[PDB]
């Protein structure tokens, strides 16, 4: 996360860290939505241009973390995966459309003051909150600059941007399954997610019922925090029917 701050303890109890077993490295962010399911971006796992095609046995999911590099004994939990599901229509070939993947944990995790799931939005919440100008929050242990990595979880609050503006900031084709967020050069505020933050959650807090809903998944962006560019996020609600299907079928 670029131009963000250190999160507070228990600020994002649904944040998950996808860790590789060999080498042992931070792969991406993800979120806990159930005691058994984790949501992430599909390019964190499959991205053929760079030969990434990770399987269950190559990953560990660490939940309850704050510190990036330390094993927070008695606080964090590490789970193994049973299955990984990538959206059958994830478009890695062109613009990472439907960049979403679900992972089933081997065993349920128990909630604590540092581990708790985030809610997934319903048509109404999506409608009233996914409006340009409204701010969401992204969290992660990814790069701090484009070209180092933080000691603890970082947070940055960014506004959603009007679709026309997103389309006009790039050559890439934006679909209705994505939304963009970030500040305009003439706003005087910065911030963005960066490499290492993909897969993590873009959440908003409902003013009606005070719950945090995950509206997006950090997907791509051209560089990190460049002026005139924005970060793109997978639109969770548009892909919720797929999410449901996988969870009440497997």
């Amino acid at each position: 996360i670029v131009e963000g701050s250190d999160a507070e303890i228990g600020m994002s109890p649904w944040q998950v860290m996808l860790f590789r077993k060999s080498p042992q490295e931070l792969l991406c962010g993800a979120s806990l939505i159930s005691d058994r399911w984790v949501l992430t971006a599909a390019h964190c796992l499959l991205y053929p241009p760079w030969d990434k095609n990770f399987t269950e046995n190559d990953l560990l999911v660490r939940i309850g973390k704050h510190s990036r590099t330390r094993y927070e004994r008695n606080i964090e939990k590490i789970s193994m995966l049973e299955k990984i599901y990538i959206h059958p229509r994830y478009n890695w070939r062109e613009n990472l459309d439907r960049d979403i993947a679900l992972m089933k944990l081997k065993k349920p995790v128990a909630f604590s003051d540092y581990i708790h799931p985030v809610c997934l939005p319903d048509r109404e919440t999506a409608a009233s909150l996914l409006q340009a100008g409204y701010k969401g929050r992204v969290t992660g242990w990814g790069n701090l600059k484009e070209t180092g990595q933080p000691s603890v979880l970082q947070v940055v609050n960014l506004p959603i941007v009007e679709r026309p503006v997103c389309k006009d900031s790039t050559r890439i084709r934006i679909t209705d399954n994505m939304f963009c967020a970030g500040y305009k050069p003439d706003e005087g505020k910065r911030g963005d997610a960066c490499e290492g933050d993909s897969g993590g959650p873009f959440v908003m807090k409902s003013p009606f019922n005070n719950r945090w809903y995950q509206m997006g998944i950090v997907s791509w962006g051209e560089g990190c925090d460049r002026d005139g560019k924005y970060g793109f996020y997978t639109h969770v609600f548009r892909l919720k029917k797929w999410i449901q299907k996988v969870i009440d079928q497997f």
Binding site: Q24, E25, L60, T69, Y71, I78, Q149
Partner: peptide, 11 residues
């Protein structure tokens, strides 16, 4: 720079 975690999670 990651710290080692319990062998029981590599398996």
């Amino acid at each position: 720079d990651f710290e080692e975690i319990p062998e029981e999670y590599l398996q």
